[PDB]
Amino acid sequence: DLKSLAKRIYEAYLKNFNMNKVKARVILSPFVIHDMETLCMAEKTLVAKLNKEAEVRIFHCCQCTSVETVTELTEFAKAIPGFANLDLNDQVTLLKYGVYEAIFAMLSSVMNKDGMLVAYGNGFITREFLKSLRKPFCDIMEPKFDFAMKFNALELDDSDISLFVAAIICCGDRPGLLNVGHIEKMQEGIVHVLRLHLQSNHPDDIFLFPKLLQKMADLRQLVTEHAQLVQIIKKTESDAALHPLLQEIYRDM
Amino acid sequence: PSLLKKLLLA
Numbered sequence: 001d002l003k004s005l006a007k008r009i010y011e012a013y014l015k016n017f018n019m020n021k022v023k024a025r026v027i028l029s030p031f032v033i034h035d036m037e038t039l040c041m042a043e044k045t046l047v048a049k050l051n052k053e054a055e056v057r058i059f060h061c062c063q064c065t066s067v068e069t070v071t072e073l074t075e076f077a078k079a080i081p082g083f084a085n086l087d088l089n090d091q092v093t094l095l096k097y098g099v100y101e102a103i104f105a106m107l108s109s110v111m112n113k114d115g116m117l118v119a120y121g122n123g124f125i126t127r128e129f130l131k132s133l134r135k136p137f138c139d140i141m142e143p144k145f146d147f148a149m150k151f152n153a154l155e156l157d158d159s160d161i162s163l164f165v166a167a168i169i170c171c172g173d174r175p176g177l178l179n180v181g182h183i184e185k186m187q188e189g190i191v192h193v194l195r196l197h198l199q200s201n202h203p204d205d206i207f208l209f210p211k212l213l214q215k216m217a218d219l220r221q222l223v224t225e226h227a228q229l230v231q232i233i234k235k236t237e238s239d240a241a242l243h244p245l246l247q248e249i250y251r252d253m
Numbered sequence: 254p255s256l257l258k259k260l261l262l263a
């Protein structure tokens with residue numbers, strides 16, 4: 001049913017994602033990590049003990065956050081009408097190429113010009129401290145901040161983002177898709193519902209929808225360049241062991 | 254069998 005599609009996707013968004021825009025905006029208005037001293041201060045309370053370099057510690061914390069978000073995005077996609085009806089291989093393909101586009105889109109909700117939220121809202125790491133790290137760890141979030149700054153200027157809310165993320169996942173352009181025509185039909189319904197929602201929620205910007213279409217293309221390019229950084233770390237950083245779920249996602253992308 | 258299939262089959 002397309003009459004209740006926007007309400008159902010928004011509800012699945014609020015149900016499955018521990019962090020959203022209205023929650024992050026409340027916190028951003030919370031320990032601050034701005035140097036090596038405050039980083040160790042935060043890790044003493046938010047990380048458990050069972051030694052590696054600080055760049056690898058932030059790497060493992062960030063990749064762990066991605067693993068949980070992939071699980072949330074999987075459950076979110078299950079609540080999208082028609083997704084569970086696809087073949088199991090098609091569901092894998094949609095998530096494989098879609099999760100990181102949705103992750104970096106959703107990352108904008110916890111970012112401002114000065115930094116981003118970490119540790120489920122309990123910490124705030126500054127933009128300069130991330131740039132002050134050694135290469136290639138300092139070249140990771142900088143293009144994400146740049147994307148987030150232009151994306152946040154659109155002033156979308158969780159109701160807009162929920163439909164945006166749904167359109168990202170249900171993309172008939174992913175390589176190796178089987179039921180291309182039916183997934184394209186699913187995308188058409190979500191995109192059309194997103195079009196009407198943007199018309200009602202943002203009547204002051206009647207060209208907001210083509211703006212969001214360009215952000216979808218910006219995200220795919222941001223992800224492809226991000227996967228190149230993943231391979232650099234995988235090949236030239238032994239202490240940065242990569243999570244098996246993330247190994248499977250980036251493999252053959 | 255892949256790990257992404259585990260999250261989808263659950």
Ligand SMILES: CCC(CC)c1nn(-c2ccc(F)cc2)c2nc(N3CCN(C(=O)OC(C)(C)C)CC3)cc(C(=O)O)c12
Pocket residue numbers: 019055058059060062063065066069103106107108110117130133137138140141226229230233242246
């Ligand atoms: C390129 C290697 C790769 C490891 C697979 C990686 N290295 N770093 C990194 C390392 C050091 C640093 F100083 C800043 C960053 C990363 N940050 C990510 N982001 C994305 C989700 N994340 C979040 O909070 O997600 C929401 C907002 C809750 C949805 C923030 C962290 C995602 C990835 C990733 O490719 O998996 C990643």
